[PDB]
Amino acid sequence: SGFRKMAFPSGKVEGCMVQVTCGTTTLNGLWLDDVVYCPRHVICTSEDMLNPNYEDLLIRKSNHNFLVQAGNVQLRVIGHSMQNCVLKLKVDTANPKTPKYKFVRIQPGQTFSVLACYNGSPSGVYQCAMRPNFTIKGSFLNGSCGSVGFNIDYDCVSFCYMHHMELPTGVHAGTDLEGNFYGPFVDRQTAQAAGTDTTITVNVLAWLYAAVINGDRWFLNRFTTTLNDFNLVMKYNYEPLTQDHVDILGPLSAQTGIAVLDMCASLKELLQNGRTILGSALLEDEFTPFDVVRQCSGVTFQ
Amino acid sequence: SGFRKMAFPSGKVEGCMVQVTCGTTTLNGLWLDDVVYCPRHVICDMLNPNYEDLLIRKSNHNFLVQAGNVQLRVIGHSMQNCVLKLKVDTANPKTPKYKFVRIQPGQTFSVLACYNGSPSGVYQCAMRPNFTIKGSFLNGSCGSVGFNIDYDCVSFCYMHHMELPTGVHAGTDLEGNFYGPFVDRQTQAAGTDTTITVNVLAWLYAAVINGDRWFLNRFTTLNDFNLVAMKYNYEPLTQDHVDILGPLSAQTIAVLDMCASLKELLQNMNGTILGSALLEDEFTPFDVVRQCSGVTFQ
Ligand SMILES: *C1=CC(=O)c2c(O)ccc(O)c2C1=O
Numbered sequence A: 001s002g003f004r005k006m007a008f009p010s011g012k013v014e015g016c017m018v019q020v021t022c023g024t025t026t027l028n029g030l031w032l033d034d035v036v037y038c039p040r041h042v043i044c045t046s047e048d049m050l051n052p053n054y055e056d057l058l059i060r061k062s063n064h065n066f067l068v069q070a071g072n073v074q075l076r077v078i079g080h081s082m083q084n085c086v087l088k089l090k091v092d093t094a095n096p097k098t099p100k101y102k103f104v105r106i107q108p109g110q111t112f113s114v115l116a117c118y119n120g121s122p123s124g125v126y127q128c129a130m131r132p133n134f135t136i137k138g139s140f141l142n143g144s145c146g147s148v149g150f151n152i153d154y155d156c157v158s159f160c161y162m163h164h165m166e167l168p169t170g171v172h173a174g175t176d177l178e179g180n181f182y183g184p185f186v187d188r189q190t191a192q193a194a195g196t197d198t199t200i201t202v203n204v205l206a207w208l209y210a211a212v213i214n215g216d217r218w219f220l221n222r223f224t225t226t227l228n229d230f231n232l233v234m235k236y237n238y239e240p241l242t243q244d245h246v247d248i249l250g251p252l253s254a255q256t257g258i259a260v261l262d263m264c265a266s267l268k269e270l271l272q273n274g275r276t277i278l279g280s281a282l283l284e285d286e287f288t289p290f291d292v293v294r295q296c297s298g299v300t301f302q
Numbered sequence B: 001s002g003f004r005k006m007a008f009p010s011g012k013v014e015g016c017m018v019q020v021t022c023g024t025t026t027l028n029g030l031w032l033d034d035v036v037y038c039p040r041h042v043i044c045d046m047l048n049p050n051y052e053d054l055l056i057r058k059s060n061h062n063f064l065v066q067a068g069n070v071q072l073r074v075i076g077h078s079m080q081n082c083v084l085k086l087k088v089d090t091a092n093p094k095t096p097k098y099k100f101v102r103i104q105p106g107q108t109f110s111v112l113a114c115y116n117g118s119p120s121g122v123y124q125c126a127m128r129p130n131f132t133i134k135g136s137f138l139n140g141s142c143g144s145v146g147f148n149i150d151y152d153c154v155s156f157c158y159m160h161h162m163e164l165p166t167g168v169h170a171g172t173d174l175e176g177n178f179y180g181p182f183v184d185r186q187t188q189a190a191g192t193d194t195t196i197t198v199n200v201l202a203w204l205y206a207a208v209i210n211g212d213r214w215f216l217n218r219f220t221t222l223n224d225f226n227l228v229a230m231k232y233n234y235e236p237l238t239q240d241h242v243d244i245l246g247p248l249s250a251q252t253i254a255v256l257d258m259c260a261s262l263k264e265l266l267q268n269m270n271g272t273i274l275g276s277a278l279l280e281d282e283f284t285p286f287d288v289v290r291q292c293s294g295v296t297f298q
Helices: A054-059 A201-213 A227-232 A243-248 A250-256 A260-272 A289-295 B051-056 B197-210 B222-231 B239-244 B246-251 B255-267 B285-293
Strands: A017-022 A025-032 A035-039 A066-070 A073-075 A077-083 A086-091 A101-103 A111-118 A121-129 A148-153 A156-166 A172-175 B017-022 B025-032 B035-039 B064-067 B070-072 B074-080 B083-088 B097-100 B108-115 B118-126 B145-150 B153-163 B169-172
Touching: A017 A035, A017 A121, A025 A066, A035 A156, A054 A077, A066 A077, A066 A086, A111 A156, A121 B285, A201 A243, A201 A250, A201 A260, A201 A289, A227 A260, A243 A250, A243 A260, A250 A260, A250 A289, B017 B035, B017 B118, B025 B064, B035 B153, B051 B074, B108 B153, B197 B239, B197 B246, B197 B255, B197 B285, B222 B255, B239 B246, B239 B255, B246 B255, B246 B285
Parallel strands: A101 A156, B097 B153
Antiparallel strands: A017 A025, A017 A066, A025 A035, A035 A086, A066 A073, A077 A086, A111 A121, A111 A148, A148 A156, A156 A172, B017 B025, B017 B064, B025 B035, B035 B083, B064 B070, B074 B083, B108 B118, B108 B145, B145 B153, B153 B169
């Protein structure tokens, strides 16, 4: 029993973290096969970040201008190319610890594990969700460039995030492993602000489904709803519910017997009046239905 | 910068997880050097077992140890308290620098939940004052270990054993000594638990370092506060506690300087601190320094 924010084992990702240094800038890189991936602003300085011409700044760099270190051993850069906001450095040696991997772009509401690193060395690992405003509520200090977010299913690591910058409000922004930013953000020093954030309904519902499997049932009512009316009643800044969403909540709905619209109506009423569910006073929205099924893996009666 | 419940990198521990099978019982084991550590309940099947007789009536080939496909030949077996030690033919080449440490109530560690010798996830948790853990364990997670990483040395401090009726979990250190008055026998109940004040204070320091300061005031002392703390079930604060909070006080406000702010936060909470409305008590002072200074292991 028990329910905790569970991150994936980070060992497979640890074997790929390297240190990338260009000029006076040093950040983390992802060593997969014979290519090292790192944010492209490593070739920048503080003065260039006010209006950087990345293509022009990269032409003025050569292969040995990039120092890639895996522990103490140095990796010779034999090629460099740029893909969106990510810099790709081809090296002479293929990483022997390279796992089976994928580059995947995730959707708002999905969760993943972040391995915070500094100087190519792991500092910690934690779970977080891609917020609807395309930001992540993580924990990052200066030098966390190149720290990656990922999911591990079977023995294949699905890389889905590379950290880049901190927004004024304290949240973090980044790209996928193809260099494309999540949201309307850019890797340049300009006035940028995260848009208004919303609560992930499907994660709150899955988390409520968790609580039921898990002892807490005080919040259930004998009320149902439809799709539109509940999505309209969101005034409380809750993400609208979709048909694919109720199809993902299907397995949890069957295991418990409560339907999605039955819990949608129950969720309404924790909103109208809002003591602790699963030990927390706030409604948690960073637990996907898959996370609940993974930890609350019980039989479904049919 | 942000503050999250941060677990240690589990790579060094993943390389030590193995599967131990005895008869029909299967759990997880810790492969360090040429010894595999696992709960002695693998040798069962029993509600009140005499482990000493059950182990003498067992031989080396009665234990099936698997790392991946690879079978580890058991060339010796011994028992220390509630932990079983299995000598194997091959020393683990992935053995990291390690230490066996018994932690104290209130200290935190990372749990690598495993099933059938394969690591499933990692999460942080604290040793509650009642010597229990509020973790997440399913059937087959027996033998999963808790640990701390300092420099390149892994400090193993917990081995999961059982789930108590209230849903909370109990286990031993790596020497087989249970945490609390629990035994690997069928009935035991966790005693009354309290909140770890020194962790609540350190967590308040973390909020301060991160921008959240709405709760700070300009003034109380030890006696007064633990008078206010005993009723909210906050574990009493000691002088060693404020000396550990010293480094955080210098980096930033003193302990009692913040103690009054906590008194007021207990007395009456209208917002969330660090994004949570509840007072978090699973962050030790070292945990805050680790997350705000960006300490890297290895
Ligand atoms: C799994 C592991 C274990 O160690 C244990 C134990 O020590 C006593 C009773 C039970 O049921 C278990 C168990 O299921």
